[PDB]
Amino acid sequence: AMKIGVIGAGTMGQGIAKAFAQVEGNTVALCDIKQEWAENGLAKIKKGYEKLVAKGKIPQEKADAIVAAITPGLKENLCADCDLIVEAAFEDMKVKQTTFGELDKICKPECIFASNTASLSITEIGKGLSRPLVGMHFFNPADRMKLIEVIAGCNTPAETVEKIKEISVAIGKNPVQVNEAAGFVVNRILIPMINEAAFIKMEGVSDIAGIDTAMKLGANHPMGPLELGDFIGLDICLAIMDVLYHETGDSKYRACPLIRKMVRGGNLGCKTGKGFYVYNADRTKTPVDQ
Amino acid sequence: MKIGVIGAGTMGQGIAKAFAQVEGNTVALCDIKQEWAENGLAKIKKGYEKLVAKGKIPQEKADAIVAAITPGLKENLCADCDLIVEAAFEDMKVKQTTFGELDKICKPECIFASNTASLSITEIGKGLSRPLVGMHFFNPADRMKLIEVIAGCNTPAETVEKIKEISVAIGKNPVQVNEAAGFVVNRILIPMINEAAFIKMEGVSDIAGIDTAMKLGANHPMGPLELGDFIGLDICLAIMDVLYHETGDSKYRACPLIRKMVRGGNLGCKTGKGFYVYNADRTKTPVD
Amino acid sequence: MKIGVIGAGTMGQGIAKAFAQVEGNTVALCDIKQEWAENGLAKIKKGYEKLVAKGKIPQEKADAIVAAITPGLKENLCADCDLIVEAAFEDMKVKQTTFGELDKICKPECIFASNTASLSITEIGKGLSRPLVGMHFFNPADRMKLIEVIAGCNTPAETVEKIKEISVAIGKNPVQVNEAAGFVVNRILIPMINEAAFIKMEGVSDIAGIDTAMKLGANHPMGPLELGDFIGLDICLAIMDVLYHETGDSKYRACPLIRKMVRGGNLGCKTGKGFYVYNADRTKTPVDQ
Amino acid sequence: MKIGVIGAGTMGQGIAKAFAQVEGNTVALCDIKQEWAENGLAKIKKGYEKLVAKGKIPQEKADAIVAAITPGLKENLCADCDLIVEAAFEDMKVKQTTFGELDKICKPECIFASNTASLSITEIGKGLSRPLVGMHFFNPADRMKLIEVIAGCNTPAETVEKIKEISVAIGKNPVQVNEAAGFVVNRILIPMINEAAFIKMEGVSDIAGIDTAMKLGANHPMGPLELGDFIGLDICLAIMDVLYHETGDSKYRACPLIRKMVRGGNLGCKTGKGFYVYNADRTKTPVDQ
Amino acid sequence: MKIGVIGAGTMGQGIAKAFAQVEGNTVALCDIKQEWAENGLAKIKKGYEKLVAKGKIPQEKADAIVAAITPGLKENLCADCDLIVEAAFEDMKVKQTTFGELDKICKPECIFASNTASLSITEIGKGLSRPLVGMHFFNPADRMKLIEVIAGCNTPAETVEKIKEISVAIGKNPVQVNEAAGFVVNRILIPMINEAAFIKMEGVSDIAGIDTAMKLGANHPMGPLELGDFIGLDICLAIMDVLYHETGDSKYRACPLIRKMVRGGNLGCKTGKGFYVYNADRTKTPVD
Amino acid sequence: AMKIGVIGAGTMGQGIAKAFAQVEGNTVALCDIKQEWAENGLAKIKKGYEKLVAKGKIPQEKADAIVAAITPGLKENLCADCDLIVEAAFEDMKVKQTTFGELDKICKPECIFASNTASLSITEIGKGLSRPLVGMHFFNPADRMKLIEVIAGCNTPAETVEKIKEISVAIGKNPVQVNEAAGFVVNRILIPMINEAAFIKMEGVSDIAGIDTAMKLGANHPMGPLELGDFIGLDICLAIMDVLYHETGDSKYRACPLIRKMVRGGNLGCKTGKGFYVYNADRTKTPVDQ
Ligand SMILES: CC(=O)CC(=O)SCCNC(=O)CCNC(=O)[C@H](O)C(C)(C)COP(=O)(O)OP(=O)(O)OC[C@H]1O[C@@H](n2cnc3c(N)ncnc32)[C@H](O)[C@@H]1OP(=O)(O)O
Ligand SMILES: CC(=O)CC(=O)SCCNC(=O)CCNC(=O)[C@H](O)C(C)(C)COP(=O)(O)OP(=O)(O)OC[C@H]1O[C@@H](n2cnc3c(N)ncnc32)[C@H](O)[C@@H]1OP(=O)(O)O
Ligand SMILES: NC(=O)c1ccc[n+]([C@@H]2O[C@H](COP(=O)([O-])OP(=O)(O)OC[C@H]3O[C@@H](n4cnc5c(N)ncnc54)[C@H](O)[C@@H]3O)[C@@H](O)[C@H]2O)c1
Ligand SMILES: NC(=O)c1ccc[n+]([C@@H]2O[C@H](COP(=O)([O-])OP(=O)(O)OC[C@H]3O[C@@H](n4cnc5c(N)ncnc54)[C@H](O)[C@@H]3O)[C@@H](O)[C@H]2O)c1
């Protein structure tokens, strides 16, 4: 028995709502700024489940049971008796401090405040609050990836972190404790990978398909780093690289200019149909270097 | 086709098996001492009997592979070789004189390839009478499917192409690489291990946590700290130092934590202790 | 052909001359203040007078090229031009806004070219209706024979080629260059100037010594410190900053001596004081005396 | 005056010419192998023959300067010289040893000067009995008018001045420079070449484009890639490495494309292949074709 | 001599006392609001009565210092000032327009000086009709003896010399500085505090241990982590960021540990918690 | 009651021997490679004490009592029943591993092995030993500076560190625990100070006397950083800067070229009569920039 409020109905908010709603005994309030926005979020969840049912990867009952646990609305209306708040709204500092400032008055004292941010400081978001703010970082798709990075801020008490650890185990995830630093663990290791592969291509060491083939066969990775950058989104990789660079001040994390040029041109990868690979209707992908 | 493998260590053994695996290939497994070459084939042979007993290879096929491998010295076995793959000790002068001697022994049409990962292909074959190309295998070479074909500064495109064709003939996937420090895999893979150590060093997370996050968050087969322990932390340290000295870029500075562990003999699996202690059972315990 | 030059500074003037000195071209000069745009065609008439007096130009030729330059009001005239060359301030949102207010004013079929020194061609032309290409001139634009032709990711070959033909049609040599911070010349030339300032700041030599060393040792036409003053030290600083921010590499960090000089208005020739003081006798004097 | 040149490569030859082409001087050329030292005076006689045939030199003048260059055996002749100019391999212990074996051979009162490109003047001359001064020539030494005069911490003014007088006495322009890695010209010029290689390696432009850009855009006499081949790419690499190690600043990290070319013997003009291939037709061809 | 001090905060108060301490000087303590200037003098006055009660100053001398200080607005009090020392809010546009207004108010021979530590002296007085020089005091200005005289790009040597003479006239030791980020003291002192935080962050030692080692090993009066807490970690962070952005050199990258503490409001003494917790007694406890 | 063996009779070895011999109940075996070398070491200790007696800063009895506790000789002869070994010989890796390899056979099992190194790895020195190797770092002059940095290597057990902590407190010093990293704590902070001051001078920001005056009055430091570099020895500052740079690979610790040029010229500071200041017979020092 647990009531979970997810603030933000975009991609990540939908996946987090699904992650909690999969576990029996959990109810999710999927909130956003405008009521229609949260309705579109749940409709996008409903539309996604109808596809998995057609492809025979989920029973219709389970999809219906999951959807019936998610209620769209406003945090003023649905988050009073919540036990956990996981915010997953737009990555803007002021918006996050405003959301949690309002939630501090709406929610009961026992409610735990968590944020799914990846680019902003857990410490700075929850500065003026009356209760701890902790990082609960999921990975796309949140309902299937089993990792959760638990982020301890400068003033987050150890009990707050432990509670998030139990909640993660209860929903069938594997919590990993991270003391707040740019990129945490996964992003800090994974995104410089893609960056290095781009440097390799830009410097003419090898070609795109070669670079990806080498990392798949030589390191037994599931995807090549350039394939992965297209899938993750090159605009997101560029932002992570720049955040790592600005937080540390270390030229080690300087972004590859080839990546910066591609983002400027709108070649963001899978979501625009073209990145390091061109994605064609026949489900064929070809490297832009032919 | 007849191949000469120079160096009967672990890598040379794997390369010999990779070529002898394919019907119609003969391999000359050479070293500086005849006994070493015969010991290399003995290690190759006994490894195949464990495979036969495990029922994972016909007894006659294993007998055929071993029969296709001849041990000895390069002066005696490499005159009519079609391809030479060097996999001896990683020293520039050792490799240079080895290929200067092979330059006089081998017939003109014989191709000279090297398995080096850290030394410059271009510098290896600087003053030779024929091109030098890189044919970088991955351990275990008989099982791993990737072959990095390293083009030197003066390697003709025809030599690169023939190595590509040989790679597919033995069932591998060649990827052309213009010579640079760390090639492709090592340039991307080892700084990853280096980054994870930095994360540990700076107190961001714990060893087991770091490794857990990479397999469950990035879908990797092994965590980077386990991987560094498996590769061996002395190898990782040496690769980082090569990348640093070849580029002059502080981006590749090795994590001082790793350098401290290498100095204490904590190299990983090969010594039983790295980021993990490897107990007599099968479990491994992080030194955290 | 009708050409519209956006900007009336040292380079807007030279680009105008570069087109007007070739027969059958007509140029529309533009700036912020009409007074400054009129100061443009004024400083052009002024320089051709000295050249005619020195016998280097026939007065008939000079009067003919000055008759092909018509100072618009920032536009009104920039409406029928077959080619646009902007030479405004090296700031990003400045060039978007300008090209933004320009996609309306000019004719539907008309080529848009930017004379930017190091900025992204792709980002400058984003919301535009037509391609945006880089056409980089070099000070002095009427004399230097090189044109760098830079294409964005979304720049067709028909526009890159048309720029190449227009370049040879006015007696220039176009070299195509892929999009990167500083392209070729500026990426090489400006850190050279930056290095020269570092050498002065660390006291390895004085201003005079550094410039005669590079002139008498590398056969360079101007010392790197004169060339800094000639280009405009504000321009050099802006290019180093773009280099540093685009690559993230401290290799391109601007020399603090130049940043101090730009903060004081010691920009070089265009303010009479940079690394040299420019006296009315037509002589220059190093500020370190 | 009697002058002893230590080294018979491209610069030992040019420094010899620079002194011998001025009346009343006599030069002693030296190298490792007498065959190589004799190859020195041979390649000098060879070049003056082509100049005389081209009418650029009177044969009487050329024969007079070739008569002032006497190839010693690495010394025997370097004993009465009033000035030593070493132009040996740019390695530190190489120059100590050479100047070490030289403090005996030469006369007690005789000036020791090094033509080093970037190495510490102070460290080169440490155990010596006399001061050690830097006298830096520039390829081609008989034509380039600049001489960099570099003093160590323990170098008196009488020696720095005597070098300044000898410089003007042979028609050169001496500029004094404080001791630092690369002095002035090389610190500015070689990273310029290094940058040009980075631009090629990252595919911004091809070899031809880069060199015509700097020639037609900055009025440079040679493109930075030709100049790399002309200087010797081994020399450029050594200078970048000295720069990187002396400052510890990754700003001066040598371009990996140059290090790859030097490892292959593609040194430029002196091996017929660098960034260009040098054909017998007297034409050069970019290796990227 | 008559001095105008612009800004009645802590620094402006100290500079006013430093000049009014010396017999024959009058000071105009100005701000943007008349009440603020009067509150600055009130803080100056009450600080002197605690000194009289402590027996560390004659009652009449303290009465004379306070009497030499007049509060108000610069338009009313600064027309006949001989020297202007600005110590208001550190914003480029604020300081620029302040000196543009003073350019019209003050008599031509009046010298314009600024106490800024992070903003460019050269840029402050860019378009003025008279030179702008830096006169950087150290808190408490009436007690600390060092004065950094900052020469701008266009500051004449005569203006630098007159500030040197004024500094010795009021009993200080002027040190000429050609404008660069961090001048001398801040350029050396703050990266030291930054380094100690890096040492803590990387697990090399503990806070108390770090601070103990610096006073007992280097004979310093305060440990760097205590010093950062005393200076205030927001000030240290801002100085590191200025040094980084002005030089573009990664050598001055601020320690991410400090940036995390500043984000949590743990600024040091001014908030009661930094690297040390400052208890109600007098002891301080490291957050280790 | 404690027997202490000090290996190395140079400057640091003498000061360490004096540090232990000052405390009642301690006996010091001051060893070196050649017997005459250790005799010269004790003679230098004796000669130094005769000067302090003349200047009236120590009683002759105390000097005599301290000297009577120090015995010169060879480690093969004097270190069998030692309770602590503090090596302070020349900073060369192989020499240190050889010394401790030999001492492992000579000394009783209870003997603690310590090294006063500042530039070399505690972990690497004691790699193949049969007992722990720990860092016990003193500061010149060791008999008066109260700080001791206790250096834990990769395999140093916590009890070894604690024993060194007690020994330091027993001899009236203040131990600080340091986990092995280049420069430890003090050198890593202090030497970049001097380096930065040299950069300030080289870049023409201020003059030598100004830089030192500013740090003395502005930061309340006892010595200016350039004064301090001359006193410490510029050759030593250059070596520390280079060790920090090579261990980390971080351009942040790159040595100032002005310092490198001065070391090449023999201007090492106080010990050569000239560094950033010229030291004249009349005890007057003048900055080399006049
Ligand atoms: C690395 C370090 O440590 C220091 C260094 O060296 S850094 C590099 C320094 N050197 C440079 O930078 C060189 C840069 N490049 C240049 O300056 C120019 O490209 C260049 C001067 C070499 C151009 O070559 P050039 O002008 O054709 O040679 P130059 O001799 O000046 O002129 C050609 C003429 O030689 C003339 N000539 C007359 N007398 C001559 C003589 N005694 N010797 C040689 N040439 C003579 C001829 O007239 C010929 O011209 P024509 O064929 O048209 O009649
Ligand atoms: C920052 C960016 O984005 C890109 C950039 O701009 S980077 C910088 C690029 N620009 C450069 O590098 C310039 C470098 N410097 C140089 O090339 C040379 O110093 C220089 C060409 C400017 C030298 O000046 P110069 O040679 O005296 O001017 P130049 O016109 O070529 O020759 C002088 C002659 O003008 C001649 N002349 C004849 N017709 C002329 C005409 N229509 N216009 C101008 N000059 C004419 C005259 O004959 C005069 O010579 P005399 O007085 O002896 O008779
Ligand atoms: N040596 C050089 O000057 C160098 C050479 C080639 C190209 N670059 C680039 O050319 C462009 C201009 O160079 P410059 O020498 O004329 O600089 P400049 O300092 O002389 O002034 C630029 C001119 O453009 C005007 N301007 C600014 N914003 C404008 C706008 N929005 N619309 C119209 N006019 C505007 C300015 O008032 C000024 O007249 C820059 O992008 C520069 O990076 C200049
Ligand atoms: N473009 C240039 O070549 C450039 C220009 C000016 C100065 N620099 C410096 O001049 C010196 C030589 O330049 P280079 O062009 O002749 O190089 P190079 O490659 O042409 O050969 C140098 C010559 O000196 C010989 N040599 C090497 N060691 C010697 C020794 N111990 N004693 C006598 N001879 C020895 C070599 O055999 C060779 O003949 C170097 O220090 C270089 O840094 C060269």
Side-chain angles (χ1 to χ4, degrees), chain A residues 57-115:
Chain A
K57 295 200 154 263
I58 194 192
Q60 181 77 59
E61 326 160 43
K62 193 47 163 162
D64 280 357
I66 284 157
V67 167
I70 303 169
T71 288
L74 308 170
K75 62 170 161 30
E76 285 72 20
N77 302 332
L78 310 184
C79 290
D81 186 33
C82 271
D83 306 303
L84 168 74
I85 293 292
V86 179
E87 91 83 22
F90 169 51
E91 294 257 37
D92 170 89
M93 180 52 63
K94 258 136 169 157
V95 168
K96 298 221 205 263
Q97 330 201 259
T98 296
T99 297
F100 277 121
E102 277 148 13
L103 282 166
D104 215 5
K105 300 177 185 61
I106 298 157
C107 301
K108 72 204 212 202
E110 295 85 17
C111 190
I112 291 136
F113 281 5
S115 171

Side-chain angles (χ1 to χ4, degrees), chain F residues 49 51-63 66:
Chain F
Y49 274 136
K51 295 268 77 204
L52 304 169
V53 166
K55 322 182 29 172
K57 295 200 154 263
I58 194 192
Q60 181 77 59
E61 326 160 43
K62 193 47 163 162
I66 284 157

Side-chain angles (χ1 to χ4, degrees), chain E residues 169-273:
Chain E
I170 66 172
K172 312 283 209 213
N173 300 75
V175 167
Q176 180 174 341
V177 171
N178 299 310
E179 174 196 338
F183 300 158
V184 170
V185 184
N186 273 348
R187 179 161 162 185
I188 296 172
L189 193 67
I190 305 309
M192 170 175 355
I193 290 148
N194 196 54
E195 192 65 58
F198 264 119
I199 282 160
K200 170 56 174 144
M201 181 181 93
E202 289 160 9
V204 172
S205 201
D206 59 285
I207 287 159
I210 289 158
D211 283 337
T212 295
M214 272 336 270
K215 47 222 298 213
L216 303 183
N219 254 286
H220 286 164
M222 273 181 94
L225 300 175
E226 335 170 62
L227 188 69
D229 273 17
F230 180 81
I231 298 182
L233 297 186
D234 49 337
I235 308 300
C236 299
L237 186 61
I239 297 266
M240 288 318 286
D241 283 346
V242 161
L243 294 169
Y244 182 52
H245 291 135
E246 287 289 318
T247 66
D249 187 349
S250 266
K251 160 194 204 170
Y252 304 106
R253 58 184 190 286
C255 176
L257 173 52
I258 294 186
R259 203 185 295 284
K260 188 201 303 197
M261 304 170 59
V262 175
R263 272 159 178 167
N266 297 314
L267 307 184
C269 298
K270 83 216 308 210
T271 67
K273 177 177 203 223

Side-chain angles (χ1 to χ4, degrees), chain E residues 71-91:
Chain E
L73 323 170
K74 64 201 193 281
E75 302 78 7
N76 302 328
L77 320 172
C78 288
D80 194 52
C81 276
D82 304 285
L83 161 67
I84 294 286
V85 183
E86 175 268 322
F89 195 22
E90 297 259 80
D91 167 49

Side-chain angles (χ1 to χ4, degrees), chain C residues 217-219, chain D residues 11 21 48 51 54 56-57 117 136-140 142-144 185-186 189-190 221-222 227 230-231 235 239:
Chain C
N219 278 343
Chain D
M11 292 287 319
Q21 69 186 4
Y48 279 107
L51 279 160
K54 258 194 55 184
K56 288 300 158 137
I57 311 268
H136 189 207
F137 290 74
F138 291 87
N139 197 352
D142 43 316
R143 304 247 92 200
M144 306 310 296
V185 176
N186 276 342
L189 192 71
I190 312 304
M222 290 179 329
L227 176 55
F230 181 67
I231 289 168
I235 306 287
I239 287 161

Side-chain angles (χ1 to χ4, degrees), chain D residues 30-238:
Chain D
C30 309
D31 216 8
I32 297 153
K33 288 215 127 283
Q34 182 103 58
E35 220 164 336
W36 304 347
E38 280 178 16
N39 277 344
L41 192 54
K43 229 234 145 122
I44 290 331
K45 292 166 172 176
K46 203 195 90 212
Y48 279 107
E49 265 179 48
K50 334 228 180 161
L51 279 160
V52 163
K54 258 194 55 184
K56 288 300 158 137
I57 311 268
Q59 184 81 71
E60 320 226 55
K61 196 46 209 293
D63 282 1
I65 77 99
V66 150
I69 311 157
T70 82
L73 96 166
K74 109 218 150 262
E75 37 107 11
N76 235 289
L77 246 148
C78 282
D80 184 36
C81 314
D82 331 336
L83 164 80
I84 276 303
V85 179
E86 74 89 22
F89 178 43
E90 188 85 348
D91 178 64
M92 249 299 323
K93 40 197 145 272
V94 159
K95 303 197 188 279
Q96 314 210 205
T97 42
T98 311
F99 275 119
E101 329 162 293
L102 268 157
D103 211 346
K104 293 191 109 188
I105 303 173
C106 331
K107 143 182 29 130
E109 200 108 62
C110 141
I111 306 195
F112 281 13
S114 163
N115 184 53
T116 198
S118 56
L119 296 189
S120 161
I121 294 314
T122 298
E123 214 213 326
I124 279 149
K126 229 154 57 169
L128 307 201
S129 132
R130 58 205 88 213
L132 192 277
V133 79
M135 199 184 168
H136 189 207
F137 290 74
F138 291 87
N139 197 352
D142 43 316
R143 304 247 92 200
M144 306 310 296
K145 304 300 197 242
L146 172 65
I147 303 267
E148 281 180 325
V149 191
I150 309 103
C153 316
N154 322 337
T155 299
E158 196 158 359
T159 38
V160 180
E161 206 52 42
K162 191 41 191 174
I163 291 283
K164 272 198 230 191
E165 323 174 316
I166 293 169
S167 292
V168 316
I170 58 169
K172 305 293 206 209
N173 294 269
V175 175
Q176 199 181 339
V177 162
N178 282 354
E179 220 205 324
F183 319 122
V184 168
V185 176
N186 276 342
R187 173 153 164 201
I188 288 174
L189 192 71
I190 312 304
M192 193 208 55
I193 296 168
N194 194 56
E195 192 65 31
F198 266 119
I199 283 165
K200 163 74 192 158
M201 175 182 101
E202 292 158 18
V204 183
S205 183
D206 62 343
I207 287 169
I210 291 155
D211 278 352
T212 91
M214 299 296 320
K215 277 197 298 206
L216 299 192
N219 278 343
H220 285 178
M222 290 179 329
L225 297 183
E226 334 170 69
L227 176 55
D229 287 348
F230 181 67
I231 289 168
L233 290 184
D234 55 328
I235 306 287
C236 302
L237 180 66

Side-chain angles (χ1 to χ4, degrees), chain C residues 111-131:
Chain C
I111 306 195
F112 281 13
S114 163
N115 184 53
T116 198
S118 56
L119 296 189
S120 161
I121 294 314
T122 298
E123 215 213 326
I124 279 149
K126 229 154 57 169
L128 307 201
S129 132
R130 58 205 88 213

